[PDB]
Structure 1
Amino acid sequence: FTLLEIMVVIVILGVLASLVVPNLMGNKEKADRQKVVSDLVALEGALDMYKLDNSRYPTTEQGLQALVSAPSAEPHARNYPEGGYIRRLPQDPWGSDYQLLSPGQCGQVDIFSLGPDGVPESNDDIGNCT
């Protein structure tokens, strides 16, 4: 009640807590990649839609928000659909949006972000080619 009720359990406690190793830490960091890589095709593929109706892409200062809402800064868009070509803007969860480039150096458009490092254009400058 004092010893058997305790001593037997002290062992069972450590014996239990000792051989219970669930998993690692950092698997979410790997997930951050595909979350952004998923955006890549989704970004360019979505921009291509706007590149079809208005026959071109939005400006840097015009930002991806133009894909979210009608491009107030000129040039204006024709047959801009409801809410643009996206429901909402994917916010990079490190305090940054997906900064597009007008014109892109790897093609028609380039996109960039701080990324997990939280630094602009250092190592986690992903968003397109580089």
Structure 2
Amino acid sequence: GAMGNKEKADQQKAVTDIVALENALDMYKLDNSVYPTTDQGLEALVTKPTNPEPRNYREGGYIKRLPKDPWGNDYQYLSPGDKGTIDVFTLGADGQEGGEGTGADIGNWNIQDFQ
């Protein structure tokens, strides 16, 4: 059957959130010269990280709040990334790598498929 409102809305939420997250990460790097490491994580965007300590952490962080994905799971983050300098993604409805339809992985590297 043709996609309906809910499925489309979830995909769009995922795209919106990944864009916002990468925007925050890019600003973190603009201030600090490097991206948060995988271990420091997306949490580095809301709370000043350690190991290593950032050189110029913005008062108030880089994002107002970390969103959860359309299935209630934290977005995923890798630095250095496998698909780009940073990977920012949701594994979709199946919560596992790969898949298709609602289970499709939506990432900063494949945004074009879901725009």
Mean CA deviation greater in 82-91 or 105-114: 105-114
Aligned to 1:88: 65
- Answer yes or no: is the 8 Å Cα contact 1:58–1:64 preserved in 2: yes
Alignment partner of 2:20 out of 34, 42, 66:
42
Q: Which residue of 1 aligns with 2:105?
A: 125
Q: Pairwise CA RMSD of aligned residues? A: 1.8
Unaligned ranges ≥5, structure 2: 111-115
Give the aligned partner of residue 32 of structure 1: 10
- Larger Rg computed on CA atoms: 1
Identify the structure with bigger relative contact order (alpha carbons < 8 Å, sequence gap 6+). Answer: 2
1:2-81 alignment to 2 at 5 Å?
26-72=4-50, 74-81=51-58
Task: Please point out which of 55, 74, 77 is paired with 1:97.
Answer: 74
Correspondent of 2:84 among 107, 117, 122: 107
Q: Report deviation, 1:95.
A: 3.4
- TM-score normalised according to structure 1 size: 0.71
**Conservation of the 8 A alpha-carbon contact between 1:113 and 1:120:** no
The runs of at least 4 aligned residues of structure 1 exceeding 3 Å deviation read none
| CA distance, structure 1, for counterparts of residue 47 and residue 63 of structure 2 | 9
Q: C-alpha deviations, 1:97-122, integer Å up to 9, x for none?
A: 1111111123210122232x232212
- What CA distance in whole angstroms lies between the structure 2 residues aligned with 1:118 and 1:61? 24
Distance 1:93 1:36, change over 3 A: closer
For 2:38 and 2:23, the matched residues in 1 are separated by 17
TM-score of the pair, normalised by structure 2: 0.79
> Could you say what secondary structure the match of 1:100 adopts?
strand
Task: Say how many residue pairs are matched.
Answer: 104
